[PDB]
Amino acid sequence: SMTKDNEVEQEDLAQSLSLVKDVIGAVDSKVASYEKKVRLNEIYTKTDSKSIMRMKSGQMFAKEDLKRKKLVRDGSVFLKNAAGRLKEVQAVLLTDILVFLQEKDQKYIFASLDQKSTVISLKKLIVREVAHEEKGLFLISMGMTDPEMVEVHASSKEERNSWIQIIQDTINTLNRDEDEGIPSE
């Protein structure tokens, strides 16, 4: 608890002590965290409300969730399903979840893969560099019990590490203050 709601209470970029939206001149960047929550509001807005999945714990993770957390990264990456058929999904890395979004019906959906984790609740995620792919990346949920990781194929050989680094970017600053290990957000 950082006296910053549940959505803003992560040192990643939000404190009642430091980190941008502390209470200083940098606190003016909070509205742009609202704006950051606002492309996320948009990305909350196109996203199908009930086209959800069962993430790390097996919960129903939905649109309402995304709403609240921080837009920290966004980019499209392919997803190898059980059949090995790729969907270039709009992956949104948020300070609280790592969510994939399949473009359906002039909007998105949770790219639900009906087995893997198409929305990896942040903090203490496991991110690995696939051996059987040059541009691939596993965004995994092993931190709990059993993940059944999903195949995140980056747009470039580098981009996979470019994405890897981002959990190594976000979660490393999440862990910094907060606890370690959170299921279902």
Curated annotation (Swiss-Prot):
Changing residue 138 to A: Decreases guanyl nucleotide exchange activity toward RHOA. Detected in mammary gland. Detected in heart (at protein level). Expressed as a 5.3 kb transcript in hematopoietic cells, skeletal muscle, lung, heart, estrogen-responsive reproductive tissues, including breast ductal epithelium. Also found in testis and breast cancer cell lines. Predominantly expressed as a 10 kb transcript in the heart and at lower levels in the lung, placenta, kidney, pancreas, skeletal muscle and liver. Transcripts of between 6-9 kb are also expressed in myeloid and lymphoid lineages, a variety of epithelial tissues, and in skeletal muscle. Residues 70-172 form the PH domain. It is found in: Cytoplasm, Cytosol; Cytoplasm; Cytoplasm, Cell cortex; Nucleus. It comes from the Eukaryota. Changing residue 28 to Y: Abolishes guanyl nucleotide exchange activity toward RHOA. Disulfide bonds: none annotated. The modification Phosphoserine is found at residue 184. Scaffold protein that plays an important role in assembling signaling complexes downstream of several types of G protein-coupled receptors. Activates RHOA in response to signaling via G protein-coupled receptors via its function as Rho guanine nucleotide exchange factor. May also activate other Rho family members. Part of a kinase signaling complex that links ADRA1A and ADRA1B adrenergic receptor signaling to the activation of downstream p38 MAP kinases, such as MAPK11 and MAPK14. The DH domain is sufficient for interaction with RHOA, and for guanine nucleotide exchange (GEF) activity with RHOA. Forms that lack C-terminal regulatory domains have transforming activity and function as oncogenes. The PH domain does not play a role in lipid-binding. Instead, it inhibits the guanine nucleotide exchange (GEF) activity of the isolated DH domain (in vitro). Interacts with the cAMP-dependent protein kinase (PKA) holoenzyme and with the regulatory subunit PRKAR2A. Interacts with RHOA. Also interacts with RHOB and RHOC. Identified in a ternary complex with RHOA and PRKAR2A. Identified in a complex with NR3C1 and RHOA. Interacts with BRAF and KSR1. Identified in a complex with BRAF and KSR1. Component of a signaling complex containing at least AKAP13, PKN1, MAPK14, ZAK and MAP2K3. Within this complex, AKAP13 interacts directly with PKN1, which in turn recruits MAPK14, MAP2K3 and ZAK. Interacts (phosphorylated form) with YWHAB and YWHAZ. This is A-kinase anchor protein 13. It comes from Homo sapiens (Human). The chain holds residues 2164 to 2346 of 2813 of the full protein.
